[model samples]
Target: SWEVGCGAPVPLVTCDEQSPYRTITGDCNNRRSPALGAANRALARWLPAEYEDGLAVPFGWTQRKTRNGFRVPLAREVSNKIVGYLDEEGVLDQNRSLLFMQWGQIVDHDLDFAPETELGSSEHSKVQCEEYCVQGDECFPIMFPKNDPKLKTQGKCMPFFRAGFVCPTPPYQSLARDQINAVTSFLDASLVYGSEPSLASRLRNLSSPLGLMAVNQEAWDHGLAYPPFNNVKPSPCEFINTTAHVPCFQAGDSRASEQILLATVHTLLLREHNRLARELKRLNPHWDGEMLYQEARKILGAFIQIITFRDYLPIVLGSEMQKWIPPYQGYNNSVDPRISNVFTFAFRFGHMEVPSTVSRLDENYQPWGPEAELPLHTLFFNTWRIIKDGGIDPLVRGLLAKNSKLMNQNKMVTSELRNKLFQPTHKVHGFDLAAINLQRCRDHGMPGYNSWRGFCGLSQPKTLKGLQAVLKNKVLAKKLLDLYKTPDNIDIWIGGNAEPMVERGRVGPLLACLLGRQFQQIRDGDRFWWENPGVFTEKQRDSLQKVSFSRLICDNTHITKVPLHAFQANNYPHDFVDCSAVDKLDLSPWASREN
Candidate 1:
């Protein structure tokens, strides 16, 4: 019987400020409140929740009219009108690569996941959410409007299971129902090494003296060292055209195989851990297996943090917002690193940038073959592609060589995402991601757009004309207002995307503030952040700084040529260089002298 805080279950533990390595469950990071950024706790709320029943019921849950006497648009209706697209033809980014999109999603999974609330008391007898469309304690299905274009033709409702609720601490057993984060909030690579002690131990290979993560034994023989196969009785992964039972790739995160590119990134990091572990073991033969594992995991976590702040965020957040986020001076115990409720909803802004198709490139950086391109929908839950389609190198090439979908106001979500997301093998119709996101914001009890505007220190627009000035697109402002009827009624996710992007960035002004604030807290509040003093030696920090994503790709995969900045799209022969030229980390700084 534990309590929930910041959308996660908080464990009671004594302070261990002296320990060099972070706790597996992220407890005692903040000594004042041991549960501050730990897993399975309630997410911090930037703005107070605005539920319809003043307690737990979601806004727009009932057929209630707005304060201005206008009906709030259905989540799907908003998607159909604003984010819907007719075709797969989206503008390719001029300077950014698909790796940028992949990295953002990877960071997302690493940070937070809101698991749906369950129905049954026992795990074996738990009821499926999709089986019930009507409103229940755990089920909040997305009902289609009578005139919905797609659903009117076939399916009527999209099954949306509500996020898990936080149980109030004892003595005060009654509290407003809120969502759980289900994972650690800090950018500590929880997804790389599981947040729970049990999962973390399971991921490691303790049988051998040399510290290493469990790798797929069969794939290792073929020179493809992917994550160990999941041995769950019935394979969780979707298989096609094969009688043999092919297991999904097991990693720190369960969503690793949700898509093939995501799985490829996970494989890259898993290889990195094993590679680092092997080197550390060689340097310090006196150290035990546990010592080697923790040291390697520490270094890997640092790599992810540095790459995100230095290489990735600059492109996503841009120069304007970067100025507001003060440079990290040192770790601050006062700072709360808990993920914000609004931040969870706002981060999904990247959903619009996902390309409709996936590419597989060859050694020459050309499409692998006539069948190199595949519809994005087909890749969902498909691990068979990774095993059958020439290993992870082809996908790695595609990530570096191909451009990402350019964010545009007119062309928002691709038809594939709007029409074909998570389509079951037996079904003709699938779920709409845009609608799902909107509903998720409401499910989490997120405040309306105008309220968030004021929270960001921007003016709350009362009229469509004022919103037009902020968005820089009059037609879009009108379209948005037409759906919500009032500027105050607009959902923050859709509202934030409607605004013009900041100079040389992917997100708008409101999102830049919200996301930038969250990342700053995440970095400053982390005690074991690589740059913080006592975490690493001066020489070790310098060597770690030299490590780049390009080198990681080079060291782990078969790709020989890569761009210096892997996140940025570039011209071959001009912007790209040989892997030999890429600077490698000098790990001699980490060598134990006494040994």
Candidate 2:
């Protein structure tokens, strides 16, 4: 049997007793954080579809399983082989803008909700030795030798991850489960607003009435602001750190400071907030710190929405596929923009694209030097590199020009994602990402690939030969059949990711459909959506529309002279542009009449 899991406040269905009963959807959803509360609320489905036979309770939680998923007969060795083979297309991705991958991830955080995973329990084939196992209800074991020669686990399949009162079983499961926003889904601007009736008064000196987050003036390094962290022992992050000695960010994800890319993005947003506060102060001098902070946060949120839906997603999802969802049409309360289980785990396909190194680049887009390249694994939690190396611009420049590994319609998994995930820092790493993806599916009891194919509106052949007919790659199809023996048994991530993609297309039809449908809901169901009527004034909206990546790059980083479309690999409109020339938003509309 499956279970409903949750994070924080524990216990059963206790309600304050409103008609349907007042339930908490999140930590501070009610009063502590209204913007995050509303935007987060808008991201979910009111009534989620079921995964287990969790008999009809009043209102619990669940998801839509239309996209493919699963746990299958994959051995660790076989999974690694699959990932390596997928690297066969191992050529560097042609110089497309790296922004596509990064922005997509940011938006995904907004859209895909991840149910916490169970760890170190429920042994599959054999008992786990006592020393290594840390007991927890959420633990489920991985298969030994690891794959299908062994049909199923002798222990309970559903080891129970954990859960609570406000899950909303009947609520939603589509675009993003937790809230498919890139940063908003996690450390939302709402977080800045404060936590509670009295406890909310923390994190600020400058603002109060307007509801804004506080900034730590001491956090900047190499002229960039980053979250505070403790860098030390267990990690250098495979290298070094001791106290406030390294660098860390205060946020929902404890490890946000652990990786360079993760650290870099966080730094940019922090920089963005401070930059906005300066502008807001200039525009409305009479406004106190609170007013300046609040207005800046509001503008920042709008940019996240516009750039994601307008500038970024369209690039990753493909122009034609995105059109299917269309622009926002007034608000519809009936729509549930909740994150779907399929899109949640499956969309992590970006891991396949992660390269072996994190590098720095200059104007012509070549590496600054071998020194400019950091072992991708070491960069995880290695924030000092930003200060030591030439700051975040090189990392940013490298990502756009660097090549990501292709999914290759691919394998038991992505090679680097499996073995190379985070090493040196995590040297002798054994667990694989693809393997975890499979277990994540089974934990959710999701349908297999064939089933997901049908949900995605694609053909799912009944026989192995039929599946072979579809793949055309007799070898791959046969290998799949040899393991699962039938089309219905293939894992969704493997199936969808492995499907043939259009030349230069990021994903195949099934994934595209799943992503397309989810993003549409992200836009339509979101109350704070940028294009929505009440979200912004017509003039405010038009000014926002003019903001571009070119400008964001110039404002956030030390670099100048970039392409108009930061998403492009090369052939910039004017070669490279002077940062001064990039578009900027006019904040006059944001000025308070009294000021």
Candidate 3:
């Protein structure tokens, strides 16, 4: 038996720096490298101390029994293999033999301490070498040379000792194959529930349940591609319906654009809800998808109702401003007036609107509630004089001109009627307010009257080219150019496009796709928006697909991918195909088995 002395307690080896056969002191008793030892040290730290201590005893004994009492099996095997090769080549010499022996010892130490369950070869090979070393003196001395001060004295011996053998090439291909098989098995046996299966199931069970379906089992099993029916002549509606969950939405026109925006908002909320459900499941494994989904839906529904109900009107109106104002003025005053008030209320409730006629119903007879209140004066006044005094004054006049037909045709007034009946009563609230405000400023002889009039002067020019000449001020001209230059801003929503898509069933998938795109746009950057989807392309669509709709809706976490059922067909036409509906699939077994 070897005498074991308690040296200074060894510092715990980190995963990043561990070795098996090598000691704490840089000595490689076995052929293991410092790197390999570091790996072993990490494994030892992860497991129970008792198991680690038990392995230590076996390792210590293996070292003590050998010639140098530090022989490791893996190192010896590698050295012997090299020696066999050298011998076959007829180039084996005493120096080469000694080198092989020393190198093998170093490597064997590394292999010995690696976890048996974690790695296949290291543990098994080390055991084999330990057996071989015990049976023969040749292998023992070759692996762990006897401690000799004169071993390095002779030239040939010194060279042999210094030049260690190379390590054996790893069977990485075989290892990879095994790992792939293992992962595949794990995935096959794993349990997964769709984002809202529980809510779906609950809805199905209730007599007056919501129409939400469970997860789409078929899509989950196969993949989301265009359905078979879409292969023939594709209608625009079919394209929209089938590819509702796809990242790209054709927003070239006003109608499509509004749809896309609403879709985006919807998808984000849905994804949020899904994320919460997933996290809840992770935290409490006992909770089924159904339970989690219902819980998540409750939370998400509250959040969505709060945010959208409060802010949606402002957002919608702000977006629709292009119709009522000219490009320059509209862009400058793009912010929803009501939203501005809300934001102001966030910090200073004192500035918030008190219930009044202006806050209730304005001149247009439209109810002037929180939604209708355009805090335009605040937003416009806050702007820099250069912007406010430049294009906005003219842009307002242009808007009035554009709506001339609507204003003139109003039966509420005759063209003969001036300020009292025609201007106030006939105009829409937003347009009326803007026109009155501009006139008031002019009547009061505001300090920037000349600049304001310069802006207004440009409105009468029929052509854009003629209008350009009227904007004599270089800065005002540049501002006008910047505001109205892009095709992105030129498109405006008419009354038809202003109506919100109210159908619940259609909105979910459309929103899912929109949110996916938006998330990708925000996280991955502009490249995601520009790149076309390709098989090998590192595009954002794949990332978008990963977002969970449930999380976004719940205001929990934003994730990629919509709930599986969100992509399913609303009307199940075929019984055979419908059988693959996500609601029918059992996911309980998977939940029980996953690591």
Better of 1 and 2 by TM-score: 1
CA lDDT, every model vs. true structure: 0.81, 0.53, 0.22
Q: Which stretches of candidate 2 lie over 4 Å from their true place?
A: 1-71, 75-78, 86-90, 113-136, 144-219, 230-245, 252-255, 319-323, 362-366, 410-414, 423-428, 502-504, 571-574
**lDDT at residue 123 of model 3 (Cα atoms):** 47
lDDT of 2 by residue, 26-59 (tens): 2222222323322222233322433443322111
Global local distance difference test of model 1: 0.81
- Candidate 1: residue 462 lDDT (0-100): 89
Considering TM-score, where higher is better, how would the candidates rank from best to worst? 1, 2, 3
Q: Give model 1's TM-score versus the native structure.
A: 0.94
lDDT by residue for model 1 (213-236), tens:
888887652475888888874554
Local distance difference test, candidate 2: 0.53
Decreasing lDDT order of the candidates = 1, 2, 3
Candidate 3 per-residue lDDT, tens place, 1-595, comes to: 2222211112443332232111222222112232221111221111111111231121112434421222323222211221111111221121111112121221122112111122333344333433343422112212322432222431111100001011212222111010000000000000111112232233222332222223212221112111111122323323333433222212101111112112233223333444555655665567654456554444443343222222222222233322222222111111211111011111111011111111112222233334533222222111121121221222211111111111110111111111111111112111121112222211111212122223223123333454345433343333333433321121111101111222221111112222222222211211111122331124322333333222232232112112232211111112112112222212222233446
The better-scoring model by lDDT among 1 and 2 is 1
RMSD of each candidate? 2.9, 7.8, 36.9
